[PDB]
Amino acid sequence: STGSATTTPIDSLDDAYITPVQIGTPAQTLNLDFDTGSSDLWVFSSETTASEVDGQTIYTPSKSTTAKLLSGATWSISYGDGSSSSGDVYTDTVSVGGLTVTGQAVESAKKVSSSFTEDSTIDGLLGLAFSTLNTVSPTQQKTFFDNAKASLDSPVFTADLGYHAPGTYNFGFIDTTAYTGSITYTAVSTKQGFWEWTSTGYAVGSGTFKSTSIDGIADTGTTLLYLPATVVSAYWAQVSGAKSSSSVGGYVFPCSATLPSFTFGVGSARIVIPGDYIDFGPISTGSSSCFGGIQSSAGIGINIFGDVALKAAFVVFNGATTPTLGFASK
Ligand SMILES: Cc1csc(Cc2ccccn2)n1
Ligand code: NA
């Protein structure tokens, strides 16, 4: 089997991407944030505290003939950005782009933090990291990918995120029309439950490539590119008037600037992030100070190749017995 679904940026900045997901019988279609940095499929629901819902579409398990309470199971998650949610668990049929899993754990939110409430466009998350990070207690649950894997034509999914445009998540096949050149594969460590890999270095604009190992994760659920302070300082030094602002919480730059590109290494291959991808617009409405898309990881404890980086590539998440990542230009 395969599946193919379109993913759409929620706003004009590409802060996140939503993908329609069918849950239950008859189908209830919710727009979920596919997150390769977490491992829970959770949804706003008929159980969510009424005051923490503002415009989301909810899952109502009592209207699904295939929904079953997973008795005793609870979940609770905190993300790197400080947000959180928690609740109880159903199993139900879940389909993505024509690929169907029966008995998927669908984590029903009773509570969500303010950042979720205030994002009317995201109806929940679909985690695509390794199932060792799943938060369900007392019986940890599998991701949608892990449950689908045995059925797929090839134990893979791919992320093809758009810049200010829709893109695609495919499951079970690699669309050889969706990228240019060849795919370079690189080793993955699953020791922290992430798609963790080591970039071979970077360049800023038309500068020389610096060969240096940068361990980090491929995370579709993180907006920005978080890298070591040395790398980030080298990038923003090439933008007149850029500075790190403690008040704003990162590097800002004059909205009048033209940003340089940023290149990252994947083995001997190179992925180029155009400068425009690194513009996240005014820090507040009408400001002439713009927020940068490359930020320091120094206060995180891990480097994160988030959407800024991933949308410059066609990315293969290879879930074979020994997982690997692949990157191609596009
Ligand atoms: C700055 C940003 C990135 S994604 C997003 C939307 C969001 C964040 C947290 C919870 C729910 N929705 N805002
Ligand atoms: Na922000």
Curated annotation (Swiss-Prot):
<feature type="active site">
    <location>
        <position position="35"/>
    </location>
</feature>
<keyword id="KW-0865">Zymogen</keyword>
<keyword id="KW-0645">Protease</keyword>
<feature type="disulfide bond">
    <location>
        <begin position="255"/>
        <end position="290"/>
    </location>
</feature>
<keyword id="KW-0732">Signal</keyword>
<keyword id="KW-0064">Aspartyl protease</keyword>
<comment type="similarity">
    <text>Belongs to the peptidase A1 family.</text>
</comment>
<feature type="domain" description="Peptidase A1">
    <location>
        <begin position="17"/>
        <end position="328"/>
    </location>
</feature>
<feature type="active site">
    <location>
        <position position="199"/>
    </location>
</feature>
<keyword id="KW-1015">Disulfide bond</keyword>
<dbReference type="GO" id="GO:0006508">
    <property type="term" value="P:proteolysis"/>
</dbReference>
<dbReference type="GO" id="GO:0004190">
    <property type="term" value="F:aspartic-type endopeptidase activity"/>
</dbReference>
<keyword id="KW-0378">Hydrolase</keyword>
<protein>
    <recommendedName>
        <fullName>Endothiapepsin</fullName>
        <ecNumber>3.4.23.22</ecNumber>
    </recommendedName>
</protein>
